[PDB]
Amino acid sequence: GGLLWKIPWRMSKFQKLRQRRRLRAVDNVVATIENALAKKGETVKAVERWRAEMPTEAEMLPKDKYTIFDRKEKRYRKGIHKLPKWTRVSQRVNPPGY
Amino acid sequence: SKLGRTPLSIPPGVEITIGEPFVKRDMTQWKQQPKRKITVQGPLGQLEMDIPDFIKIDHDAEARRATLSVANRDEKEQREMWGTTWAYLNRFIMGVSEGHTAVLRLVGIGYRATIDTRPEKEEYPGQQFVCLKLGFSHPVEMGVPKGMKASTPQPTRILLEGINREQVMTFAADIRRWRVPEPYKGKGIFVNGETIKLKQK
Amino acid sequence: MKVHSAIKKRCEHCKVVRRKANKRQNGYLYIICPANPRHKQRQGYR
């Protein structure tokens, strides 16, 4: 193509820091909701599903925090900043093996 | 370095003088590394070198020995110069005591060498000039550097002598550069037993 | 001399060295052999 979308293949240490904090912030929203309901003895299927198949920022590997799965790439990995609205959508899990 | 650890046996007559660390101011460099001036004197002559300061020399007089050591073996630069500085000293000691020699063999029909004087091209008074007839339209004349003695026991053999090995072997290579040995007949100038494998025909 | 991107030893007398490296250029990897001068190789172009 001749139209230039200058998007670097890797992120800067500043974009990574904000990513860690956005993943950390989401964990606090879920924990705040889960703790508020536990005090009343209630549960929500969405929360129970999140805490079951989604890790916390402290439990994620750097590769899972800054990259995503892409079957079209050489090594099946791709910069997470290449996902649409990547700063406002949740993305923490990739297929096993990649 | 297994060579640097090896002590250096100072034969009789040879005297090693180690100076104190000094730095000469250079206007183009912000920091010059200190160096030590080592003078090896004896019968044939005297030689001097400037070694880095991280190389420590324990000169034993009554025992006539001198071992080298470095301040940090894990540094690449210190390891390298440990063996290099040891090798240079071993040559300085054996050169001021016995002297280094190089033999050049001239192979070919019409290859001759003669030692004479050329007062018109002499760089210093009494400079000897090795004249070589090597099949060229013109004569090849080379002046021996100050500090060496050249001779010709036979017309097809040259003998160089001096206290500095780097100066002797460098001059031998300057003469050999006129006729490098060829593989088809063996014609050329051979230095210190240098040989060349011949060809089929 | 043979210039290749994949230089390899061809006998027990071949040696890998990096020559012509100085304060201006990085140099080249060489295969030098005192036995056979047909083993001489260089990796990289000027």
């Binding site: - | 250079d26 206007m27 183009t28 460099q29 912000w30 920091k31 | 304060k23 201006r24």
Partner: protein, 183 residues
Amino acid sequence: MSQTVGATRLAYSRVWHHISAVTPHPTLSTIKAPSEAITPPSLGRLASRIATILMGKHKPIWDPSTDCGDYVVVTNCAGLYTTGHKKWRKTYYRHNTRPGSLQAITMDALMEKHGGAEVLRKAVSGMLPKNRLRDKRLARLKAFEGDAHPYKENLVRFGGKVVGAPGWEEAVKAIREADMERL
């Protein structure tokens, strides 16, 4: 508005600062330990400090429209400190719009024709705003190859002690102590 009503004579005056390219600089050097390893300021790190003085951005009254910059006398530019192999592998280019007339030269070859002063002028020049004050500000940079320069009497002083001299900080403190004996 009270903070600006007064005598602005000395705020807009041209101060003559001095720096040596060979003296170690604990602030501008990257190595900070041990004390014997502290280097002088590298070419670009020194140039970035100078461009700030030439612009006047160290002054609390700074404004980009006003030319409130100072002078900077640099000495010992022959020992300009550089890292890696910049001295022999960095190239400076030049063209005059004529195809084929591209002029190239290395740093070591430029220091042989015009000395280390020109290497520092080019580095400071590119760090200044690209406007009509760039040539004036760059002209106030006084770069010399050795210790001799015609401004040994212009350098700022405090009690007769030039800034950067051995005991210039004691001369300054002695003057302020005697300045508090008033209402």
